[PDB]
Design a protein around this ligand. Structure first.
Ligand code: HL7
Length: 481
């Protein structure tokens, strides 16, 4: 329930008031996920979902404040409103799950109980709604509009488990999926939501099969296993400032930025590489004085991935590659994309890994080709004369070819092939020839750029890629084989 220490910080008439609430709750032994998710959901609703202030609705009020170029109206999170919704949730879950009927062997939650709570959330949801709809992540959505996005279901199951007093059930995240972790050592996995559009219902099942499959979706087992603090972080990263496709709520941007700096300072993003990248993106738009540069943050994310996740994550490098791409840094962007490909090389492409495929596809056949086309125009009155770029480009295609190896479905098709030739061509033979494609001569040590191919496809083409004249026939045929 809501304790006196929580209720005294209400009402929340500003961003700074909401941050105070989070700061307090993060200090608590067990931060209340339900309360924090409801508050965020409440403010997001009026700052992005429906910005029109209600004319008839009493008891609901707005707080005027000076804006940095007139006035801004913030939704006042009243204790009456937030507690009413909090009460509705706890009522709904407690009045559906009979704890007496389940034996809590030394506090450890049984698989049967986990599945029950998972079913309560699942069966409460609307029969038909657009699953990729924005602002349907928070518990405010589950209560007010009974709609939740894919990862939102998993967050709710964890929030609901917490309400029931089950302090061992936690959120488990990958880079494109969410599930639950529980057990006496927290080694029992349970699917509690769906993935993609029409890929069957694996709910209630274990994650073991996807981990063994070497699929990017279950990150070969080196996925995030949240604590209550990392769950709060997820919640903050889940803030959606999008009003529409081209505009954003400044208050929700300013709110997500402040909450992430708070989380950072208590060291709660040290195991969340994608959060460091999100904070970096926000620091790029409106940098807060005193705080580190976006590049410091982009690399803190990469550092986190290498330290706590065996350097098996893709987005930390994508976040950096995007920043350099935005800043037209070409070599640095192509370096970062080549690093991304080195990670995906020891993964196998499975049907459910479609999101990361679409990402590599856009960079290989749209983003990189545009950067090189732009680079070519700027030459006529530099990165196309740098041999390191051409090495990075080839290392990028090396990782993708290596990824395809051992995969049940092919990655590279004739569509990838055309853009390889085009991109190779953007570099003059003289520049291409400077890159030495060496397999190595002596293993270890005793007491122009150099590149080694890991993939068979790229190895078989080493001589073709470096030739003065490009044989489109052979290069296309070898990449697609
Ligand atoms: C923010 N951290 C986080 O955990 O946000 C959670 C919170 C709620 C769900 C959400 C998420 C994430 C969202 C972030 N993307 C990562 C972002 C970073 N990208 C990114 C992709 C490509 C490039 S590029 O360089 O190739 C490029 C640049 C320019 N033009 C073309 C291409 C640059 C940047 C996407 C990851 C998923 C949502 N998701 C649907 C389910 C989910 C599931 C588990 C964990 C998190 C999440």
């Amino acid at each position: 329930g809501l304790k006196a220490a929580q209720k005294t910080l209400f009402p929340l008439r500003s961003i700074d008031d909401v941050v105070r609430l989070f700061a307090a709750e993060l200090g608590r032994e067990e931060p209340d996920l339900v309360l924090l998710s409801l508050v965020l959901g409440f403010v997001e609703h009026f700052l992005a979902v429906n910005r029109v202030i209600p004319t008839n609705v009493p008891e609901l009020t707005f707080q005027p404040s000076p804006a940095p170029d007139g006035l801004t109206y913030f939704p006042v999170a009243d204790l009456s409103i937030i507690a009413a919704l909090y009460a509705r949730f706890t009522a709904q879950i407690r009045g559906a799950v009979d704890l007496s009927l389940y034996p809590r062997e030394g506090g450890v939650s049984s698989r049967e109980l986990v599945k029950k709570v998972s079913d309560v959330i699942w069966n409460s949801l609307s029969r038909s709604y657009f699953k990729d709809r924005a602002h349907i992540q928070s518990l405010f959505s589950f209560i007010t509009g009974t709609k939740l996005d894919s990862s939102g279901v998993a967050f709710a199951v964890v929030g609901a488990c917490q309400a029931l007093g089950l302090r061992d059930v936690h959120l488990a995240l990958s880079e494109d999926h969410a599930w639950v972790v529980f057990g006496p050592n927290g080694e029992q996995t349970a699917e509690v939501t769906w993935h993609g559009k029409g890929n069957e219902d694996r709910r209630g099942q274990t994650v073991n099969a996807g981990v063994a499959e070497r699929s990017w979706l279950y990150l070969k087992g080196s996925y995030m296993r949240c604590d209550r603090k990392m769950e709060v972080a997820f919640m903050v990263c889940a803030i959606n400032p999008s009003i529409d496709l081209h505009t954003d709520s400044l208050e929700l941007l300013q709110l997500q930025q402040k909450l992430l700096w708070l989380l950072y300072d208590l060291g709660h993003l040290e195991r969340y590489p994608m959060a460091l990248g999100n904070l970096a993106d926000l620091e790029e738009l409106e940098p807060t004085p005193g705080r580190p540069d976006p590049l410091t943050l982009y690399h803190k994310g990469i550092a986190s991935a290498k330290t706590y996740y065996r350097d098996e994550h893709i987005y930390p490098y994508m976040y950096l590659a995007g920043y350099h791409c935005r800043n037209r840094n070409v070599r640095e962007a192509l370096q970062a994309w080549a690093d991304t490909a080195t990670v995906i090389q020891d993964y196998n492409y499975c049907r459910e890994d479609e999101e990361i495929y679409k990402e590599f596809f856009e960079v290989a056949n749209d983003v990189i080709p545009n950067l090189l086309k732009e680079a070519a125009s700027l030459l006529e009155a530099s990165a196309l004369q740098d041999p390191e770029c051409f090495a990075h480009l080839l290392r990028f295609y090396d990782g993708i070819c290596k990824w395809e190896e051992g995969s049940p479905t092919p990655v590279l098709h004739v569509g990838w092939a055309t853009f390889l030739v085009q991109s190779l061509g953007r570099f003059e033979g003289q520049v291409r020839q400077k890159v030495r494609i060496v397999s190595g001569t002596v293993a270890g040590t005793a007491r122009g750029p150099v590149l080694t191919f890991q993939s068979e496809k790229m190895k078989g083409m080493k001589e073709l890629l470096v030739a003065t004249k490009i044989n489109s026939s052979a290069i296309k045929l070898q990449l697609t084989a």
